[PDB]
Amino acid sequence: AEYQNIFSQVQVRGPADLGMTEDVNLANRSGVGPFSTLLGWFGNAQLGPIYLGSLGVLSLFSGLMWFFTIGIWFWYQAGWNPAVFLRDLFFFSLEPPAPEYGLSFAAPLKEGGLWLIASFFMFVAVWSWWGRTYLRAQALGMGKHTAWAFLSAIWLWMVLGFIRPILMGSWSEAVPYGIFSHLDWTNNFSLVHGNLFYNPFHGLSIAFLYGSALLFAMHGATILAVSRFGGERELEQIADRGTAAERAALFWRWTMGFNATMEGIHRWAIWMAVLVTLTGGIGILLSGTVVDNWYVWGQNHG
């Protein structure tokens, strides 16, 4: 049995890594957290530090405010009974206002005001967290890729909960807060729109979603195969290709007749992934605003 580098055989620890200063305001970093020998068989053992700071707190508090707004409604739905709460946990739902209130903020708590409130806390939690991904990069001198990519996820989420409802004319179009209820919403959306399998954008989304599983299986597996030549140290291999980058590229060139670079691969990655939610969001945004029935649309190919 040859060693496969899925798990480490020996962990080593030294001083808590406090990381790079650059332009970070160190006043705002916690200190380290514990060290998890468990995590350490697979990845890094060190937890923390994290970086708090103004926007962080806004986000974190605001996010709890959302989580708690939903949970209150759930207890309420359980008539305050613990054993019921636990029982019906995946069945509770914080539903948006009825079609009748339109886009008004004037619906009763018990039928929408609470949804809108919870949605308000979510909106600030996500955007402040976005801005966080940008600023943590800024302070470190780093590129803005993570914030751009996060924008791609944000797009789908904005379309589902906010852009589409507005265009459509009402908050009733939006997604409820529930484990089971959200899946029902999902099913019903497709049903009511002629089956999303007829939306060229849904189908693109799938190709990317699958593609990401394929790409990362491939990438991950490759780096692991060429890790006995230091493959995982991708940035130095970018600055100074080693036999790792080379055997990596040549495996694929000999297999399928073309190949990546140790930096290019990462551009394949970022795009495979971002394109999932990119197409996805267009696909949804179009639905009902412009196309009522993807089967019907599909019949006139236009």
């Binding site: 899925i6 990381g19 054993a83 590129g143 990401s212 990362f216 495996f251």
Partner: protein
């Protein structure tokens, strides 16, 4: 026809079968025994599909479809025009896939690398063989498998799914979808991390793995650079494992409406009968 660094690697050796017989390239492509096997299987397979296309009366790629034996053939053979061609194309497809992984193994040996890629590929092959071989055999008929056609395969997805109501409620399907989504998230982020290090702000120098910092700053953890490649691998393979679990069990150990499976939790004696809430 060669990458600037390629020649030092194009040495003899590593083949699994044939010694030096098929040890050679054609353009960038390595051949090998299993490159030959692959060609023979993929070529036959395509020829049989084009034939099945003639028997069906179309050349449109949006229409061409090869359906399996209808349900009343069980697990025997069917006349070529009535699911026999599918049966032979499926033998071809499997031949082509396995050959391709074994050709991958052969490349690995020439290049002195690890076998991780063909290992990873084997999970996809297993997903495929679950849908077209394992599930049908356990269910008693080839006609349970999906047909080979761009849109007709999608019909099979929907009709199989709705046989159990909203397929969302398949518990394995949920775990699987979780891996898919998570894996996409890890792809987005690994890609963006590395790129933001290699491509820093205008004029600044290339950053370093110390990256760990950015992520710790952001969420209080960083898995590391060996770690993330281990992750993507695990995430995406796990999505496909659960994908295959979620279908190996459907139509076999569970065949009613997936939503109803969840009743075992609600119906637990300690709370089954307490009133209030959605199921009280």
């Amino acid at each position: 026809a060669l990458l600037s660094f390629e020649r030092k690697y194009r040495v003899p050796g590593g083949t699994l079968v044939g010694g030096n017989l098929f040890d050679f390239w054609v353009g960038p492509f390595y051949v090998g025994f299993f490159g030959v096997a692959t060609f023979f299987f993929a070529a036959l397979g395509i020829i049989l599909i084009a034939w099945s296309a003639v028997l069906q009366g179309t050349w449109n790629p949006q229409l061409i479809s090869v359906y399996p034996p209808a349900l009343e053939y069980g697990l025997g053979g069917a006349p070529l025009a009535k699911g026999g061609l599918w049966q032979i194309i499926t033998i071809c497809a499997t031949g082509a896939f396995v050959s391709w992984a074994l050709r991958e193994v052969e490349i690995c040996r020439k290049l002195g690398i690890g076998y991780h890629i063909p290992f990873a590929f084997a999970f996809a092959i297993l997903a495929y063989l679950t849908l077209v071989l394992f599930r049908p055999v356990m269910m008693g008929a080839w006609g349970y498998a999906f047909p080979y056609g761009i849109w007709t395969h999608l019909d099979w997805v929907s009709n199989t799914g709705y046989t159990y109501g909203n397929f969302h409620y398949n518990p394995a399907h949920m775990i699987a979808i979780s891996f898919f989504f998570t894996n996409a998230l890890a792809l987005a982020l690994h890609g963006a991390l590395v790129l933001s290090a290699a491509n820093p702000e205008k004029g600044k120098e290339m950053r370093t793995p110390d990256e760990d910092t950015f992520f710790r700053d952001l969420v209080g953890y960083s898995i590391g650079t060996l770690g993330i490649h281990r992750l993507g691998l695990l995430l995406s393979l796990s999505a496909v494992f659960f994908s295959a679990l979620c279908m190996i069990i459907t139509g076999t150990i569970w065949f009613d409406q997936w939503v109803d499976w969840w009743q075992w939790w609600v119906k637990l004696p300690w709370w089954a009968n307490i009133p209030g809430g959605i199921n009280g």
